[PDB]
Structure 1
Amino acid sequence: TRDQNGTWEMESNENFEGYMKALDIDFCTRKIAVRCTQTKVIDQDGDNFKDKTTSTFHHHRNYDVDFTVGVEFDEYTKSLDNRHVKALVTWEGDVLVCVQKGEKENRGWKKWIEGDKLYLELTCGDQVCRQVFKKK
């Protein structure tokens, strides 16, 4: 049949990355594009076509870590760089301090309550990231 009218949801995708490579699309765009869902709305009147395609990219990660202060533990940093470190968490006053021994030097974090907010400083080498969280 020639009638392509309808709302179409992509259910299978084969060799999208090979096609994109042939178009000289960079590895980054290919990595996001191949993870997208695709919805195609086709409005067709005889030989006249309107095609609206919506591509959607959705990312969710969960990263769960359990530890006991003072007991060195094995950490696999799956939510970041996916490396194995030997982490040791200790208290320095009211600050929670973690050294993450492994491939990277000067790697760890500090976590503390100040005001009614949670402060997190992550360090690796010469870089320090500071994050602040509020209670929900």
Structure 2
Amino acid sequence: PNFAGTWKMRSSENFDELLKALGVNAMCRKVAVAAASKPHVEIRQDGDQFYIKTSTTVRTTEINFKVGEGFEEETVDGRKCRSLATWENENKIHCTQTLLEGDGPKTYWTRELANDELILTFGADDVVCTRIYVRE
């Protein structure tokens, strides 16, 4: 059971389309595609408490949060937001994001276990990027 373990991305869908929906410029988008191709995720779960390490070739980001408690993070394009995760059900976290400064697209992420795969989705207005992870 559980979200915890080491994950390798098996597939990604609609990354470029999501970034365009976020108002990321063409040059950054074009380049950013290659670099994000093969991320490794380490997740620690203790009930509603999470530590998530996301490693690329270029960078590691580490965040902690609790399901049920407001916290702070960045959007996929690195803009500051307040976040709130709840369990949609036993195997799925939905996390709403609200920008701290100004206006921009409505963003969210979700994480889901299905068939012992981790399905990460990012939303930006009507667009949805889907990243599918398997245990390594």
Query: TM-score with structure 1 length normalisation?
Result: 0.52
1:129 paired to 2:126? no
Cα deviation, 1:53-97, whole Å, max 9, x if unaligned, reads: xxxxxx5111111000111011134xx422100000110112101
Q: Which has the higher strand share?
A: 1
1:70 to 59, 68, 71: 68
1:96 paired to 2:93? yes
RMSD: 1.8
For residue 7 of structure 1, what is the aligned residue in structure 2?
Answer: none
For residue 115 of structure 2, what is the aligned residue in structure 1?
Answer: 115
1:82 to 78, 82, 85: 78
> Structure 1: which 5+ residue stretches go unaligned?
1-27, 33-58
Whether the 8 Å contact between 1:104 and 1:125 is mirrored in structure 2 is no
Aligned equivalents of 1:84 and 1:61: distance in 2?
18
Residues paired across the two proteins, number: 78
Cα deviation, 1:12-38, whole Å, max 9, x if unaligned, reads: xxxxxxxxxxxxxxxx6xxx9xxxxxx
Displacement of 1:126 after TM fit? 1.8
> Structure 2: which 5+ residue stretches go unaligned?
1-26, 32-56
Provide runs of 4+ in structure 1 moved above 4 Å: none
Displacement of 1:104 after TM fit? 2.9
Aligned equivalents of 2:62 and 2:104: distance in 1?
22
Instruction: Determine which structure has more spread, i.e. the larger CA radius of gyration.
Output: 1
Query: TM-score with structure 2 length normalisation?
Result: 0.52
Displacement of 1:129 after TM fit? 0.2
